[PDB]
Amino acid sequence: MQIFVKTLKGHVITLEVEPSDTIENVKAKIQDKEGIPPDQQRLIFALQQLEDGRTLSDYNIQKESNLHLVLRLGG
């Protein structure tokens, strides 16, 4: 399915993922599209910052869900 990630800059991007994808995997997708190292990405959904080891199905992120990307600013 397609899920939306609203980046920090403001614009929204699209990602093709399956519920079996890891948070680390999705971060790699964002890194490909936006060039953001996963070390700086804070993926947020349902007022929760998502954790690496888990997957999208562990969070029930369904078709056309809107996720937030907040960046870790400062080295």
Partner: protein, 162 residues
């Protein structure tokens, strides 16, 4: 343009943390108080807005408030999951000379100090790309920081007319 500031659209992404994407120039409402690019500029900026009679050493106090702030909050901070260090290893690195601050320290200091901190991020032209607010205050009551380029931080003072 003060009806613009009392109308910012903050989105709470997690409890206590907000994001905004307004369209304004930082110079339209703030005064940039520049800070040395010495690697401690995050803490210089806070001291500039929180410690009267600031000096080039006042930032050590902010770092020490970050220490106690970390002992309270570090293990429960979502952004701390990205550091991947124990409280001891983090405290050593954080307290080391010329080690640079980040949004993780802004969140913990907001709690420790009982203030609201906003980090406005710009891209070269000082045109704001976004804002991250730690705390429930507004723009007039908060400690406004300016983040530019990679890791540099400067202090912002809301102008007398706003």
């Amino acid at each position: 343009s003060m009806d613009f500031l009392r109308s910012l659209d903050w989105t709470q992404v997690i409890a206590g943390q907000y994001v905004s994407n307004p369209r304004f120039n930082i110079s339209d409402y703030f005064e940039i108080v520049r800070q040395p690019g010495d690697g401690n500029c995050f803490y210089h900026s806070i001291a500039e807005l929180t410690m009267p009679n600031k000096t080039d050493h006042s930032y050590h106090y902010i770092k020490r408030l970050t220490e106690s702030a970390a002992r309270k909050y570090y293990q429960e901070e979502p952004e701390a999951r990205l550091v991947g260090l124990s409280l001891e290893d983090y405290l050593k690195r954080m307290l080391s000379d010329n080690e640079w601050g980040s949004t993780l320290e802004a969140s913990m200091l907001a709690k420790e100090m009982g203030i609201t901190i906003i980090i406005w991020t710009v891209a070269a032209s000082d045109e704001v790309e976004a804002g991250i607010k730690f705390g429930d205050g507004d723009v007039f009551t908060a400690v406004n920081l300016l983040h530019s380029g990679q890791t540099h931080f400067d202090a912002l003072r809301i102008l007398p007319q706003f």
